[PDB]
């Protein structure tokens, strides 16, 4: 991600391939998770479900 700041940034799926076709019907819990560094595990800053 870049800059961020107080203003919200149009991010995530702009022209990406994150679209997933589900199989079972029901309630699914999608989970965004932010990390400081790009190494496993790193530091999880926040996680909105």
């Amino acid at each position: 991600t870049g800059a961020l700041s107080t203003t919200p940034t149009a991010n995530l799926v702009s022209a990406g391939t994150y679209t997933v076709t589900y199989a079972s019907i029901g309630t699914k819990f999608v989970t965004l998770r932010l990390y400081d560094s790009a190494v496993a595990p790193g530091v999880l800053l926040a996680s909105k479900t």
């Binding site: 965004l32 932010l34 800053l45 926040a46």
Partner: peptide
């Protein structure tokens, strides 16, 4: 440290 998110 503080991060507001939406989804």
């Amino acid at each position: 440290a503080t991060y507001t998110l939406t989804l």
